[PDB]
Symmetry: C2
Subunit: 202 residues, 2 copies
């Protein structure tokens, strides 16, 4: 109920089914939804005013809980990048977590990695350096192998787009191999095509 019907229908790729929830929610959950459909139907756009309002809310949030983290993470590619990076930078320093429930640590790590991928896309390499050290501390002495695999690919992506280095190639191919070994075919194929485009477009 929380966000289950979100990703449940995202599994089936039924656009018109949670598009049905434009008319329950709040305005922030309404924009979080709209930016998700921007990935499905590339013309369902949350325009700036509803994005600037959620971004302003997150800017004055003092403590980041599950509510704020899921809201930001779902709109990392619709809120303007300059705000997303600052909000990510603030979420990293103010997310609520103790040692029983580390669920907030996971999705914060997944968010920081997704923002790192976006930072590589925008060629914000100074911001990539910051996020790389923040993610390594989130992963260190933890057993978050999924985030470690995505972070390894993102590290190779950063090293490739910046230098076309052989080392960045190997990191990306090693992360794909982890997904291959663990039977994660859908993730492996999406990361393979992303890798194919990188080398086959230069």
């Amino acid at each position: 109920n929380l966000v289950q019907y979100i990703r449940k229908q995202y599994s089936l790729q039924n656009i018109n089914n949670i598009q049905s929830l434009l008319s329950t929610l709040d305005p922030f959950e309404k924009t979080m939804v709209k930016s998700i459909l921007h990935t499905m139907d590339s013309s369902i756009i949350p325009s700036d005013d509803e994005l600037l309002q959620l971004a302003d809310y997150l800017f004055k949030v003092e403590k980041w809980g599950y509510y704020e983290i899921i809201l930001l993470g779902n709109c990392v590619r619709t809120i303007d990048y300059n705000s997303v990076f600052l909000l990510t930078k603030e979420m990293l320093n103010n997310y609520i977590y103790s040692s029983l429930n580390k669920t907030n640590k996971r999705i914060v790590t997944q968010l920081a990695i997704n923002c790192l991928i976006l930072s590589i896309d925008m060629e914000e390499f100074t911001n990539c350096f910051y996020l790389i050290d923040e993610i390594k501390a989130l992963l260190d002495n933890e057993l978050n192998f999924y985030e470690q695999t995505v972070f390894l690919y993102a590290t190779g992506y950063f090293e490739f787009k910046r230098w076309q280095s052989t080392s960045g190639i190997e990191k990306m191919k090693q992360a794909i191999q982890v997904l291959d070994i663990l039977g994660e075919d859908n993730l492996k194929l999406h990361y393979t095509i992303h890798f194919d485009k990188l080398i086959n477009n230069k």
Copy 2:
């Protein structure tokens, strides 16, 4: 405080430091501690009476929370196997979890896998078949890559000890490769030596 000083001192291998807590606790946390030191000092043995009392408590536990799961998991190799398997079988069917906090799902999965490794050790192959299907359901449509890697090695271990099959060899070597790729050197080396003994002793 909960179990931090347990694994914190376990990182430093300081035996005499949480051995200091035999004289805070309850009798169940006292036996959970004692069986942990049985891995360090192989003569610090929790004798049967304190093990049968915790095992009896877990047998009548109606709902398995973080308390019961951590108690069983730390004594899977000191409580008699016949009880450990039945308790694992009951924990799988009665562990408390909802969709925000899936921490109980993780350590239940890690427990079931550790009991699977012990079941392979005891040549309880009928019990291995049961645990394999239970772990696959716990992992399915989840992103628990660490448990997936350990479960893959355990699957290859089961297939090797039962048939010395080439397929079991590959699964174990692939799980070691995941640990190698993700920089998990300590886990990779422990799993490598375990793998070395399997093939170099037949």
